[PDB]
């Protein structure tokens, strides 16, 4: 149903090694299209996917006089955050920016967000209403008050509801067989003996789109939750994903255990049992 | 497409 374009920004200060490091990345759902590196050769916004490859050069030059100026605003930011936190000049500090928009089943604006965090801890984020700010620090308020002055919340609102979605649609159409695709997992189950007396069942899910999935073990119908290990969804390579769940089973009891896969890409939830 | 108006804290 919903579709998201988000943007990701990174600025790590580096004392005695010149000007801070900058990394901007764009994402459509879970597909990457634009990336930037103030350390790489070309100094140009890079395409990755075919649907952005098609976009002409007036855009590229426009989004490299833009993202170099994005960097500049993030480079100055690092200094303000040292003044506010009362910190030492020689110190590797990380600032991060992420804005974005969503579009539902139909294709119109759903939700928006724009958020800053520094060193890892939360700083400031726009709420759901896009009318007020979340200031998650004792002295991140001093920034919040200023971000009402120039009606920053209101100006951003118009972007997220404006070109954010207008271009999101464009891209989605620029390559319909790249983004609007949905891939269902290729599921099976393996067996590992940890001893004569202990065993492991492992619910596989190979190459699927997008990320969102809910694997959970079942033991006699009941929600099995004790002897269960499960990893973070891992990116394969060819625009696909993988996730597995592990359960510890006593030597002999296998039939009792049935898997339960969830996804929007399969008719109804899939169940897996041991051979 | 990127964001056009930028703010400093």
């Amino acid at each position, epitope marked *: 149903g919903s579709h998201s374009m988000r943007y990701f920004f990174t600025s790590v200060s580096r004392p005695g090694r010149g000007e801070p490091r900058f990394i901007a990345v764009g994402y459509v759902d879970d597909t990457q299209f634009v990336r930037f590196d103030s350390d790489a050769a070309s100094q140009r916004m890079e395409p990755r996917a075919p649907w952005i490859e098609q976009e002409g050069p*007036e*855009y590229w030059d*426009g989004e490299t*006089r*833009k*993202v*170099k*100026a*994005h960097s*500049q*605003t993030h*480079r*100055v930011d690092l200094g303000t955050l040292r003044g506010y936190y009362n910190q030492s000049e020689a110190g590797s500090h990380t600032v991060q920016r992420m804005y974005g928009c969503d579009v539902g089943s139909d294709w119109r604006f759903l939700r928006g967000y724009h958020q800053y965090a520094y060193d890892g801890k939360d700083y400031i984020a726009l709420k759901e209403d896009l009318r007020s700010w979340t200031a998650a620090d004792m002295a991140a308020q001093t920034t919040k008050h200023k971000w009402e002055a*120039a009606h920053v919340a209101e*100006q951003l609102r*118009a*972007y997220l*509801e*404006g*070109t954010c979605v207008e*271009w999101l649609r464009r891209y989605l159409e620029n390559g319909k067989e790249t983004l609007q695709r949905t891939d269902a997992p290729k599921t099976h189950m393996t067996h590992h003996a940890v001893s004569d007396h202990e065993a492991t069942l492992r619910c596989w899910a190979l190459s699927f789109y997008p990320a969102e999935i809910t694997l959970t073990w079942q033991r006699d119908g009941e929600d099995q939750t004790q002897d269960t290990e499960l990893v973070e969804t891992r990116p394969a390579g060819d625009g696909t994903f993988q996730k597995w769940a592990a359960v510890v089973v006593p030597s002999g009891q296998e039939q009792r255990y049935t898997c339960h896969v969830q996804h929007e890409g399969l008719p109804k939830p899939l169940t897996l049992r041991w051979e | *497409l*990127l964001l*056009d*108006r*930028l*703010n*400093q804290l």
Partner: T-cell receptor
Amino acid sequence: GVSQSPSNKVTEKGKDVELRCDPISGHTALYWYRQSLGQGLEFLIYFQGNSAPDKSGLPSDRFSAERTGGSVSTLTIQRTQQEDSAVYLCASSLDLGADEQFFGPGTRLTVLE
Amino acid sequence: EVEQNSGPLSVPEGAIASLNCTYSDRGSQSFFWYRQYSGKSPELIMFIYSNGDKEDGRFTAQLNKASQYVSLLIRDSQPSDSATYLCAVREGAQKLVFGQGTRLTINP
């Protein structure tokens, strides 16, 4: 508000001139513009902190502006050509992508021989 | 580039005066309207970020990204208005590029 120093300048061809524009206190962005009689507002160099992010758009190598010694800014034109007789405007900015820019009264420049 | 007709426009007092401006890069987002007098100094008075209808009393800046233009409507035009109106687009990311501007005269 803003103030550009001084009032005016009439000079002989071949002079150097520094131009002062004391900008609004607490503004981390400065733009240099030039416009006169016939001409419209023509851009020169925009600043940020103390780095010159965009230097392109200057008639000669005689043109070089710098803003490093604080917030206040300077514009240097060496060996004044007669072709640079114009009104030099300087405008600050609180943010970079903020609403209004604030122009000082500007400084008219005449290069006779 | 950002092109614009420069009149000059001459309007009677009371009548609505209308200023037009266009641009190239479709994906623009920042649109401003500065007003400068007799070689004084530009003073921003209208700015718009999204398509539609914004009003500062008399001023009525209208934007439309479709055809790639932006307008300005001054209802109840006073003689204290005659001055070069000035549209502006934000190029790259930060930097404001200008049109020649349109000279106005409000015949009293």
